[PDB]
Amino acid sequence: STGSATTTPIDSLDDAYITPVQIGTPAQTLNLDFDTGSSDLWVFSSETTASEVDGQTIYTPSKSTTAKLLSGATWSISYGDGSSSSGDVYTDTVSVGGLTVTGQAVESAKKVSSSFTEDSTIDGLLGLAFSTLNTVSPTQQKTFFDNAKASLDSPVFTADLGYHAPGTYNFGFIDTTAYTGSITYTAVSTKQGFWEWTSTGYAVGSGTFKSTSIDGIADTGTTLLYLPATVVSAYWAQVSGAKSSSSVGGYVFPCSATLPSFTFGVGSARIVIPGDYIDFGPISTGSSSCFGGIQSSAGIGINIFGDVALKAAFVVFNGATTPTLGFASK
Numbered sequence: 001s002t003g004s005a006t007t008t009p010i011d012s013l014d015d016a017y018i019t020p021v022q023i024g025t026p027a028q029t030l031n032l033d034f035d036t037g038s039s040d041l042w043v044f045s046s047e048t049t050a051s052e053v054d055g056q057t058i059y060t061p062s063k064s065t066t067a068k069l070l071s072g073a074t075w076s077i078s079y080g081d082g083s084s085s086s087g088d089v090y091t092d093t094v095s096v097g098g099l100t101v102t103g104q105a106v107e108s109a110k111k112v113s114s115s116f117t118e119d120s121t122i123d124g125l126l127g128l129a130f131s132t133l134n135t136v137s138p139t140q141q142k143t144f145f146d147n148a149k150a151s152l153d154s155p156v157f158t159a160d161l162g163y164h165a166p167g168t169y170n171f172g173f174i175d176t177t178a179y180t181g182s183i184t185y186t187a188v189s190t191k192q193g194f195w196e197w198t199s200t201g202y203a204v205g206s207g208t209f210k211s212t213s214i215d216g217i218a219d220t221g222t223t224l225l226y227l228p229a230t231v232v233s234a235y236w237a238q239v240s241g242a243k244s245s246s247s248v249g250g251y252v253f254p255c256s257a258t259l260p261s262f263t264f265g266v267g268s269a270r271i272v273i274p275g276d277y278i279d280f281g282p283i284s285t286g287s288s289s290c291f292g293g294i295q296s297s298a299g300i301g302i303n304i305f306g307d308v309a310l311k312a313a314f315v316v317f318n319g320a321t322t323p324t325l326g327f328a329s330k
């Protein structure tokens with residue numbers, strides 16, 4: 001089997017991407033944030049505290065003939081940005097782009113933090129990291145990809161995120177028309193439960209490539225590119241007037257600037273992020289200070305190749321017995 005679904009930016013800045021997902025019988029379609037940095041499939045639901053729902057589409061398990069309470073199971077997750085959610089668990093039929101998993105754990109939110117409430121466009125998250133990170137207790141549950149894997153034509157999924165445009169998540173096949181040149185594959189460590197890999201270096205603009213190992217995670221659920229302070233300083237030093245602002249919470253730059261590109265290494269290959277991908281717009285409406293798309297990972301504990309980086313590539317998440325990651329230009 002295979003699946004193919006379009007993923008769409010939630011706003012004009014590509015702050016996140018949503019992908020329609022069918023849950024239950026008859027289908028209830030929710031727009032989920034596919035997140036290769038976590039491993040829970042959770043949704044706004046009929047159980048979510050009413051004051052914490054503001055415009056989201058909800059899953060109502062009582063209206064699904066295939067929903068079953070997973071008795072005694074609870075979940076609770078906290079993300080790197082300080083957001084969180086928790087609740088109980090149903091199993092139900094879940095389909096993405098024509099690919100169907102029966103008995104998928106669908107984690108129903110009883111509580112969500114303010115940032116989730118405030119984002120009316122995101123109805124939940126669909127985790128695509130390794131199932132070892134799944135938070136369901138006392139019986140840990142599998143991700144949609146792990147459940148689907150054995151049925152897939154090939155044990156892979158791909159992320160093809162657009163810049164200010166829709167893109168695609170495919171399951172079970174590699175669309176050889178979706179990228180240019182060849183795909184370079186690189187080793188993955190699953191020790192922390194992430195798609196963790198080591199970039200071979202970077203360049204800023206037309207500058208020389210610096211060969212240096214940068215361990216980080218491929219995380220579709222993180223908006224920005226978070227890298228070591230040395231790398232990030234070298235980038236922003238090439239933008240007149242750019243500075244790190246503690247009050248704003250990162251590097252900002254004059255909105256009048258033309259940003260240089262940023263290149264990262266994948267083995268001997270190179271992925272170029274155009275400068276425009278690094279512009280996240282005015283810090284507040286009408287401001288001439290703009291927020292940067294490359295930020296320091298110093299306070300995080302891990303480097304994160306988020307959407308800013310991934311959207312510059314066609315990315316293969318290879319879930320074979322020994323997982324690997326592939327990157328191609330496009």
Ligand SMILES: NCCc1cccnc1
Pocket residue numbers: 033035036037038079080081083125219220221222
């Ligand atoms: N790997 C990104 C985790 C995440 C998801 C949704 C909101 N905040 C953080």
